[PDB]
Amino acid sequence: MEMEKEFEQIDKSGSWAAIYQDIRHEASDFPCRVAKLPKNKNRNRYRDVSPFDHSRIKLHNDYINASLIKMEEAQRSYILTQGPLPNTCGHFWEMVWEQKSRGVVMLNRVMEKGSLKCAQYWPQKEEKEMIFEDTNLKLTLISEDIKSYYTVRQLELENLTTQETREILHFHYTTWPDFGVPESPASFLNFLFKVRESGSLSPEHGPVVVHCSAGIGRSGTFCLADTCLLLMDKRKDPSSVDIKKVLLEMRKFRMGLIQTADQLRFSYLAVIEGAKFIMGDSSVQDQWKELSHE
């Protein structure tokens, strides 16, 4: 694969920083007029992380800090959003409901570096459901499966207006530090494939909702890897994937995707290693499971 040749050349010349900064300089710039309106100040976690108008998710005030990353060639969509705020947990679950998502991928912890980077937007106990009065939704913890570095939750979301009920799967990576990277390619891919195996990325469901704290760094890394693997999967041709071009394509839909050079570097590693599975190595998934120490 060309990505592996290019990774070798970037490593040898120690130029991940320059390569990553070139991507930032070339990244699309689009207006975020709605996000910046005064009435939406308290709906944004970070003043400088906004959804572009053209790709933003509208609630059915229609504003949420969330973007539809619509990957035409790969035929997969993701919604990337910030970690919900205390006043936007209702909006968040409303979006899940309206967009018909089946999975939420959370790549952060509620507390990071002493600070609250995400609201407690799901119930931690079966007998303590959450009711969101503004959006008329009820959220119940049904079960959870806790592993050493991630947790999967079965949630029940009820639209109280219609009394319809849906099952939402919550995939919570708990050891991915802000501005950092997963422990190994194996941990990351073990997690990614857990999401894939649930059905949550199927085109029969709405786009998976992915978030971290700002919904760009770790959320970006996750989606870049998944898309690159899907592209080579559809063509069965690892060598045809250009990672930097795919990342630039994603950045047309939301700003700042992948926040450090090392996250970009890690994405190459994950994609090169995931390629083994795509192209028919049937022992590698169990290797990843074992190496992840779940």
Ligand X SMILES: COc1ccc(-c2ccccc2)cc1N1CC(=O)NS1(=O)=O
Task: Annotate the chain with three-state secondary structure.
Answer: CHHHHHHHHHHHCCCHHHHHHHHHHHCCCCCCCCCCCHHHHHHCCCCCCCCCCCCEEECCCCEEEEEEEEECCCCEEEEEECCCCCCCHHHHHHHHHHHCCCEEEECCCCEECCEECCCCCCCCCCCCCEEECCCCEEEEEEEEEECCCEEEEEEEEEECCCCEEEEEEEEEECCCCCCCCCCCHHHHHHHHHHHHHCCCCCCCCCCEEEECCCCCHHHHHHHHHHHHHHHHHHHCCHHHCCHHHHHHHHCCCCCCCCCCHHHHHHHHHHHHHHHHHHCCCCCHHHHHHHHHCC
Minimal distance, residue 63 CB to Cl ion, in Å: 17
Q: Toward Na ion, which CB reaches closer, 54 or 58? A: 54
Q: Which stretch binds Cl ion (CB under 5 A): 113-121, 136-144, 217-225, 274-282?
A: 113-121
Residue 109 in the binding site for Cl ion (CB under 5 A) = yes
Interaction pattern, residues 237-256, with ligand X; x per rule: CB under 6 A: -------------------x
212 is catalytic: yes
Interaction pattern, residues 40-79, with ligand X; x per rule: CB under 6 A: ------x-xx------------------------------
Minimal distance, residue 54 CB to Cl ion, in Å: 27
* Residue 213 among known ligand-binding residues: yes
Q: Which stretch binds Cl ion (CB under 5 A): 5-13, 108-116, 131-139, 275-283?
A: 108-116
Active-site choice (32, 89, 212, 228):
212
Residues 156-195 that bind ligand X (CB under 6 A): 178-179
Per the annotation, binding residues are 178, 212-218, 259
Residues lying near ligand X in the complex (CB under 6 A) are found at 46, 48-49, 108, 112, 117, 178-179, 212-218, 256, 259
